Design an enzyme around this catalytic site. Structure first.
Site, PDB file in Angstrom:
ATOM      1  N   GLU A 173      -4.478   0.771  -3.955  1.00 46.61           N
ATOM      2  CA  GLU A 173      -2.853   0.955  -3.966  1.00 46.61           C
ATOM      3  C   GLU A 173      -2.267   0.372  -3.842  1.00 46.61           C
ATOM      4  O   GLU A 173      -1.684  -0.190  -5.115  1.00 46.61           O
ATOM      5  CB  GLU A 173      -2.986   2.166  -2.794  1.00 46.61           C
ATOM      6  CG  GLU A 173      -3.445   3.440  -2.364  1.00 46.61           C
ATOM      7  CD  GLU A 173      -3.138   4.307  -2.216  1.00 46.61           C
ATOM      8  OE1 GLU A 173      -3.196   3.771  -0.399  1.00 46.61           O
ATOM      9  OE2 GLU A 173      -2.684   5.698  -1.912  1.00 46.61           O
ATOM     10  N   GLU A 203       1.018  -1.114   0.241  1.00 47.57           N
ATOM     11  CA  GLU A 203       0.082   0.132  -0.007  1.00 47.57           C
ATOM     12  C   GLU A 203       1.014   1.528  -0.299  1.00 47.57           C
ATOM     13  O   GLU A 203       0.854   2.322  -0.512  1.00 47.57           O
ATOM     14  CB  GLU A 203      -0.620  -0.287   1.019  1.00 47.57           C
ATOM     15  CG  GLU A 203      -1.648   1.275   1.507  1.00 47.57           C
ATOM     16  CD  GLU A 203      -1.716   1.679   2.492  1.00 47.57           C
ATOM     17  OE1 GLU A 203      -2.143   1.046   3.692  1.00 47.57           O
ATOM     18  OE2 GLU A 203      -2.195   2.787   2.537  1.00 47.57           O
ATOM     19  N   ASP A 220      -7.118   1.088   0.204  1.00 41.35           N
ATOM     20  CA  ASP A 220      -5.838   0.115   0.530  1.00 41.35           C
ATOM     21  C   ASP A 220      -5.378  -0.610  -0.464  1.00 41.35           C
ATOM     22  O   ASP A 220      -3.887  -0.608  -0.309  1.00 41.35           O
ATOM     23  CB  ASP A 220      -5.543   0.577   2.303  1.00 41.35           C
ATOM     24  CG  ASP A 220      -5.746   1.286   3.171  1.00 41.35           C
ATOM     25  OD1 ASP A 220      -5.003   2.707   3.176  1.00 41.35           O
ATOM     26  OD2 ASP A 220      -5.730   1.179   4.358  1.00 41.35           O
ATOM     27  N   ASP A 277       0.544   4.182  -3.161  1.00 39.67           N
ATOM     28  CA  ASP A 277       0.150   4.956  -2.761  1.00 39.67           C
ATOM     29  C   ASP A 277       0.976   6.135  -3.975  1.00 39.67           C
ATOM     30  O   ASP A 277       0.437   7.095  -4.358  1.00 39.67           O
ATOM     31  CB  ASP A 277       0.003   5.115  -1.709  1.00 39.67           C
ATOM     32  CG  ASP A 277       0.482   7.016  -1.565  1.00 39.67           C
ATOM     33  OD1 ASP A 277      -0.367   7.929  -1.635  1.00 39.67           O
ATOM     34  OD2 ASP A 277       1.565   7.699  -1.556  1.00 39.67           O
TER      35      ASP A 277
END
Ligand SMILES: [Mg+2]
Ligand SMILES: [Mg+2]
Ligand SMILES: [Mg+2]
Ligand SMILES: [Mg+2]
Ligand SMILES: [Mg+2]
Ligand SMILES: [Mg+2]
Ligand SMILES: [Mg+2]
Ligand SMILES: [Mg+2]
Ligand SMILES: [Mg+2]
Ligand SMILES: [Mg+2]
Ligand SMILES: [Mg+2]
Ligand SMILES: [Mg+2]
Ligand SMILES: [Mg+2]
Ligand SMILES: [Mg+2]
Ligand SMILES: [Mg+2]
Ligand SMILES: [Mg+2]
Ligand SMILES: [Mg+2]
Ligand SMILES: [Mg+2]
Ligand SMILES: [Mg+2]
Lengths: 216, 218
Positions: B108, B38, B105, B42
RNA sequence: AAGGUCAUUCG
RNA sequence: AGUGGCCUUGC
RNA sequence: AAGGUCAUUCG
RNA sequence: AGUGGCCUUGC
């Protein structure tokens, strides 16, 4: 001259205007400047750094890696990486107007420029970035040159010991308004320390760094 | 069942454990979960979105593109993109524990997983992301289907008119502590409005939206 | 435009 | 990362 | 862990 | 984006 920078980068641009744009401040040219490239460059370089961190610590949590990232994608660290390129000598802006903010922005724009000029080759640009800075980044980490977040560290110390947070207050401000110098005081219980800087936050970070030592 | 997700993604994993990790919440497994993916995801997805914005508006300033980016890389928007993948049906976590935070989450993490599994081919992963979401993103922008920032818009209205910023205060809070409902009041000069939400910020955003309307209607 | 300041949003 | 109000400086 | 809250740092 | 203190809930 642009050729000298290309030599330092290890990359020759096809569209020289792209490189010129990355090096030009808006105050120097309102048509072709680095602001949009900087926007893209920030996201691109942040990705390069985060990927490198995860690659060399695949099993480490976000709580370990993010503090490192926070410093490694900072304007301060980018200025250090930029030195290797003597970037300041290629920036197009009025003489004496260059500062760390400008250098940091151009650094990001420069990488967006390489990315775009290469035909948006993210893999190529990432590896070129690593060719130049991978060892510098890893060494900064291993040799303890990653800066600490003293304000956060301090409140964790005080919150663990007293379940309270430190307090900061302004003691004095001097100099021209566009070049102020702040002096602040950090406090917890009966412990007090001073710190100075070009902004209140900077002065507070300095005071926190001292207060931590005092508590020890 | 993973095969069904791969079909929706248009990508077959070489290392199935990578995909499994991206779909697994830490409460389900403390060894192989999506937290690190994650973190990488991102940064990866943010880059994909920012590049797309600049590509279709090369001459637009950061002040025009960043507000769009702010919404397009938000948890809220990621939940909308995730729907296209019915992502919620593949997440490994206790039944009934899935919420918007988890979905955002995993979204990502899933992209970081594709990136890594493909041998860290950022170009390929970027194009796979675009194949699935490029039109969705560009259409959202062109049609104005971008969440407005009412708190910021409001203070710009009040600062331009009176060189003053609005004030917010809590009026009431109710419900269990882990499921609170807030009611806040927004004010500027003699104008006041109320807003409610699951957090003070959310309630303030609603109160700000109402206040903007009150000012325009005045 | 650059420095500072107050505030706000996004990650 | 963006933006707005305010002070200063620069043009 | 998940929700909320106060605070802090980085972009 | 990270982290810490506090309240609640979950296992
Ligand atoms: Mg070459
Ligand atoms: Mg800029
Ligand atoms: Mg940056
Ligand atoms: Mg930047
Ligand atoms: Mg910068
Ligand atoms: Mg302050
Ligand atoms: Mg996480
Ligand atoms: Mg994100
Ligand atoms: Mg995330
Ligand atoms: Mg998230
Ligand atoms: Mg309040
Ligand atoms: Mg608040
Ligand atoms: Mg300014
Ligand atoms: Mg925030
Ligand atoms: Mg900025
Ligand atoms: Mg929490
Ligand atoms: Mg900040
Ligand atoms: Mg977070
Ligand atoms: Mg308990």
């Amino acid at each position: 001259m642009l050729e000298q920078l290309e030599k330092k980068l290890g990359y020759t641009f096809k569209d020289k205007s792209l490189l010129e744009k990355a090096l030009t401040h808006v105050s120097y040219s309102k048509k072709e400047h680095y602001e949009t490239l900087e926007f893209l460059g920030d996201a691109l370089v942040n990705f390069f750094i985060v990927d490198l961190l995860v690659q060399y610590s695949p099993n480490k949590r976000e709580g370990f890696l993010s503090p490192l990232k926070a410093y490694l994608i900072s304007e301060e660290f980018f200025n250090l990486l930029a030195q290797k390129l003597e970037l300041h000598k290629f920036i197009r802006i009025k003489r004496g107007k260059i500062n760390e903010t400008i250098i940091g922005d151009v650094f990001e724009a420069l990488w967006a420029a390489v990315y775009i000029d290469s035909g948006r080759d993210a893999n190529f640009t990432r590896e070129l970035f690593y060719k130049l800075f991978k060892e510098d980044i890893l060494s900064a980490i291993k040799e303890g040159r990653v800066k600490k977040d003293y304000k956060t560290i301090l409140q964790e110390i005080t919150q663990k010991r007293w379940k309270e947070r430190p307090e900061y207050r302004l003691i004095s401000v001097e100099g021209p308004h566009h070049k102020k110098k702040f002096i602040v005081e950090a406090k917890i219980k009966e412990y007090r320390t001073l710190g100075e800087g070009k902004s209140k936050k900077e002065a507070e970070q300095r005071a926190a760094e001292e207060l931590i030592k005092l508590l020890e």
